[PDB]
Write a protein that binds this DNA or RNA. Structure first.
Lengths: 126, 103, 736
RNA sequence: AGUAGUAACAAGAG
RNA sequence: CUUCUGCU
């Protein structure tokens, strides 16, 4: 991340719904669970079947990454759910509402100041 | 009428399996008697399609009516039918994920 | 030079400095002893506030009942529960007219809920009165005990797993002539129909501990398993209705609630005419629960469920019917002492109906004399009022209906009103051409509330110009003011475990910075104070410190062995690396790049014995109770580490008659934990099926053994042994 | 005695 | 006596 100057201003934070976990943009709740189940409990999947190129790619990548993993399956499923299912919460925001910005909301937007911050990594085109 | 005929013309576990499946399906066993008999015939035939059939050490299919418990015989057929959906589909996934056959 | 902090209000507006007026840095006033006195006082007050009603005697329970509905109108500002059914129905009808289809849509959704709700949902929550033991038990334990009792008595319809079937079973049990229960010496007890009914409608009572802002203590009530089933559907319907009401701020919570209130109030202030004077009334309603009669909720449920299927109306209306016949258990009892003989003793509440009055003081003697007529089998009949009513959403709907009645099209006058209502708290905005109009509107609103039984507390309410008010401890001064004192108890060590505490502490600091106006300098100092408290509480001081503690040797050895000290977790004596930059990063991930590989492997070893995982519903989640309001579920980001252990459990039940229950719990765990070894997804998703566990586990074992053999994960000898054992298990189940 | 305050503690169950 | 317990 990159830090810019801190500007003292009269911050007016409005309460609205913002993204906590962006999840996967091409998968819905159901799609996420379908991949989760298939990756963590391939035998207990049930009648559900993967029906999307995105689901197949994610399942293949996670299975390749989770080879010989002795971690407790419940933790793996919980972490996958965190990474995939979209989660939103009402927060008093003044700047960007993206997850990359909401997570550092405490550091960037204050009651009488704003910290110019540019989170690392790539940003979603949308 | 019909329920008594099914009780008298089928094995205890067969009628038990059929009736339980009826309960999980939603229909009452004492009302939809034709369905009950059809289910019992189906279950019976499915289970017969695996009775006495085993695989020996050479991988060849053999038939053993008097099943010896000390003989290392692997059943040739695994009955998916007669179990709860969940358990059945669990067996389906176990077979697909290990053998590789499409689900 | 007498310093006086109150004089600070001469310059800073009270609201901007409201945090100063909160003593939340001190210990909350706990309650000492039994809650019998408070419960009897609450019953006596509830019956006194409806003393002019009709007295009847129940034909089933045989206990006296009071019906204040349609009683005389209030001739004084004294709190009155004589609600008028026609006025309540008229208010509901006007509410429906103002929001067409609200009841139809809410009923459609609630109906579906009823169809899809499972029995497990009753496991949520805590401290339910288990009628099989006459004691408070966890919701899951009370539910299981009730289910086991019903099965032993022939009520076998709850096996479908649908909550409506369990409710049906409850109804059949109510019609049962005799009930059989088990006690433990595993004795059997028989309950007659009357006694069953009394113990099925009984509500246990305790004292509200750690309540702030009140001098006198109060008593709260918990219902049994039978009532909880219908209460869930009634609350679901009320919630569905409240979601569509603009003035109802109850269903929402957190920032969503503040956002709703700010938007609603803003719009209310806006649509107001420029030529119309505006005033705002702030204040609670006195004796809210003691005056909300269950018959009124029955009337509202019947009106809401108009045109709906008869089964839906019956299932929704069962809850108010049972609550109208509810009996409150007095409680622990009373304690006596002899100074001359120097000895103490305890009299159970069940003995108060027959005990002599010479042992009590004047106040308790009067309370006993006044409650004696209503005392039935150690429980007092409590038909009037709603003792610690769970119908918070329904009461909010009623209050909103009264609020909605203040539109200019209903008042048919120059003045009009609107506002916000949540439970017993409200904020009313009245617009009128002049002060006379404001007074007329206030009087009309007060009288209409009295009509419905609701009654504004003139003692703790005030009216001022529109723009500033207080609602549920949120102080609005042209915009909600960020009060920080309310969140002070949330600081410090949460007390979950060595790992969850750190993540929760930093998460609390971050949340307060975001929401409660915590300055960055204050955030830094807070972080420092929290780390110091954390270290002094878990004895995890820095390895290079000379502080002496029973855990100092292991920490010292670990500090000497590690090469990169900065990588050690704070729980292992490592230095604190947190700051405003990374309050959102879990410490394991924050120090991962600095941790030594050997220590990193030891700390995150998945085979470690300390880490334990329950259902996913209880993974990385904790229950935190703030200064005001009920318990809330807080989700924290933490990595599974050896520090994520579980604290010891209370063993006081180990030397009592009910010790067998704990043993049973152990047995159940011994079986459920084994099932997890057969069905790995048992925790992530609830398993389904009608077959016995043993049958499912043996079948799964046979399938897995075959699949492993075919794949080659096991040898011929291992497979032969497995099946041999499976056949032995089947024979063991058959032999019995 | 003391804590404390509408009722307790100043150990309790074997 | 000794055993058991500090939210049951």
């Amino acid at each position: 991340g990159t830090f810019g100057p801190v500007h003292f201003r009269n911050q007016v934070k409005i309460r609205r719904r913002v993204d906590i976990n962006p999840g996967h943009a091409d998968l819905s709740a159901k799609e996420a669970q379908d991949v989760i189940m298939e990756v963590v409990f391939p035998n207990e999947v049930g009648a559900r079947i993967l029906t999307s190129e995105s689901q197949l790619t994610i399942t293949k990548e996670k299975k390749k990454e989770l080879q010989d993993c002795k971690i407790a399956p419940l933790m793996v499923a919980y972490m996958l759910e965190r990474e995939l299912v979209r989660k939103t919460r009402f927060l008093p925001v003044a700047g960007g509402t993206s997850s990359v910005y909401i997570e550092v909301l405490h550091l960037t937007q204050g009651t009488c100041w704003e910290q110019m911050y540019t989170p690392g990594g790539e940003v979603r085109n949308d | 009428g019909m329920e008594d005929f099914v009780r008298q013309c089928f094995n205890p576990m067969i009628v038990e399996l059929a009736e339980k499946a009826m309960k999980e399906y939603g229909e009452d066993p004492k009302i939809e008697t034709n369905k009950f008999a059809s289910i019992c015939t189906h279950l019976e035939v499915c289970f017969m399609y695996s009775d006495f059939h085993f695989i020996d050490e050479r991988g060849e299919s053999t038939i053993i009516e008097s099943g010896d418990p000390n003989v290392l015989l692997k059943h040739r057929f695994e009955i998916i039918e007669g179990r709860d959906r969940t358990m059945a589909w669990t067996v389906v996934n176990s077979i697909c994920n290990t053998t590789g056959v499409e689900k | 030079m007498d310093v006086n902090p109150t004089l600070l209000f001469l310059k800073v507006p009270v609201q901007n400095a409201i945090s100063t007026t909160f003593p939340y840095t001190g210990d909350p006033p706990y309650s000492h002893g039994t809650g019998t006195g408070y419960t009897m006082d609450t019953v006596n007050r509830t019956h006194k506030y409806s003393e002019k009603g009709k007295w009847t005697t129940n034909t089933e329970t045989g206990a006296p009942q009071l019906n204040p509905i349609d009683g005389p109108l209030p001739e004084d500002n004294e709190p009155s529960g004589y609600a008028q059914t026609d006025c309540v129905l008229e208010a509901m009808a006007f509410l429906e007219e103002s929001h067409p289809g609200i009841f139809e849509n809410s009923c459609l959704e609630t109906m579906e809920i009823v169809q899809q709700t499972r029995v497990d949902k009753l496991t949520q929550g805590r401290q339910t009165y288990d009628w099989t033991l006459n004691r408070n038990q966890p919701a899951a334990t009370a539910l299981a005990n009730t289910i086991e009792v019903f099965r032993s008595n022939g009520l076998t319809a709850n096996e479908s797993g649908r909550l409506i079937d369990f409710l049906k079973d409850v109804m059949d049990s109510m019609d049962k002539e005799e009930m059989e229960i088990t006690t433990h010496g595993k004795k059997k007890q028989r309950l007659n129909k009357r006694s069953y009914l009394i113990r099925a409608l009984t509500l246990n009572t305790m004292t509200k501990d750690a309540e702030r802002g009140k001098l006198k203590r109060r008593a709260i009530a918990t219902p049994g398993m039978q009532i909880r089933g219908f209460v869930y559907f009634v609350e679901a319907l009320a919630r569905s209705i409240c979601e569509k009401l603009e003035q109802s701020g109850l269903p929402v919570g957190g920032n969503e609630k503040k956002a709703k209130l700010a938007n609603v109030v803003r719009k209310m202030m806006t649509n107001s005419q420029d030529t119309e004077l505006s005033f705002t009334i702030t204040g609670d309603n006195t004796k809210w629960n003691e005056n909300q009669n269950p018959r009124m909720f029955l009337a509202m449920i019947t009106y809401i469920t108009r045109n709906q299927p008869e089964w839906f109306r019956n299932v929704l209306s069962i809850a108010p019917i049972m609550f109208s016949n509810k009996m409150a258990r007095l409680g622990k009892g009373y304690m006596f002492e002899s100074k001359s003989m120097k000895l103490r003793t305890q009299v159970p509440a069940e003995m108060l109906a027959n005990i002599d009055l010479k042992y009590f003081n004047k106040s308790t003697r009067e309370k006993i004399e006044k409650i004696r007529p209503l005392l039935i089998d150690g429980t007092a009949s409590l038909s009037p009022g709603m003792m610690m009513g769970m119908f918070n959403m329904l009461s909010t709907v009623l209050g909103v209906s009264i609020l909605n009645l203040g539109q200019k099209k209903y008042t048919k006058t120059t003045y009009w009103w609107d506002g916000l209502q949540s439970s017993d708290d409200f904020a009313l905005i009245v617009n009128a051409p002049n002060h006379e109009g404001i007074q007329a509107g206030v009087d009309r609103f007060y009288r209409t509330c009295k009509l419905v039984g609701i009654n504004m507390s003139k003692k703790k309410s005030y009216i001022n110009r529109t723009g500033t008010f207080e609602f549920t401890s949120f102080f609005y001064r042209y915009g909600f003011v960020a009060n920080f004192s309310m969140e002070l108890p949330s600081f410090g060590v949460s007390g979950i475990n060595e790992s969850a505490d750190m993540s929760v502490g930093v998460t609390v600091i971050k949340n307060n910075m975001i929401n409660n106006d915590l300055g960055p300098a204050t955030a830094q100092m807070a972080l420092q104070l929290f780390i110091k408290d954390y270290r002094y509480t878990y004895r995890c001081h820095r390895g290079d410190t000379q502080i002496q503690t029973r855990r100092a040797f292991e920490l010292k050895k670990l500090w000497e062995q590690t090469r990169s000290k900065a990588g050690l977790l704070v729980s292992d004596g490592g230095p604190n690396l947190y700051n405003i930059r990374n309050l959102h990063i879990p410490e394991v991930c924050l120090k991962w790049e600095l941790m030594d590989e050997d220590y990193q492997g030891r700390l995150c070893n998945p085979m470690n014995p300390f880490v334990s995982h329950k259902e996913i519903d209880s993974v990385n989640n904790a229950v935190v109770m703030p200064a005001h309001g009920p318990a809330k579920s807080m989700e924290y980001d933490a990595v599974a580490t050896t520090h994520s252990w579980i604290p010891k459990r209370n063993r006081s039940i180990l030397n009592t008659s009910q010790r067998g229950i704990l043993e049973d719990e152990q047995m159940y765990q011994k079986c459920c934990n084994l099932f997890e070894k057969f069905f790995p997804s048992s925790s992530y998703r609830r398993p389904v099926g009608i077959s016995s566990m043993v049958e499912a586990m043996v079948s799964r074992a046979r399938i897995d053994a075959r699949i492993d053999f075919e794949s080659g994960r096991i040898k011929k000898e291992e497979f032969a042994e497995i099946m041999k054992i499976c056949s032995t298990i089947e024979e063991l189940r058959r032999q019995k």
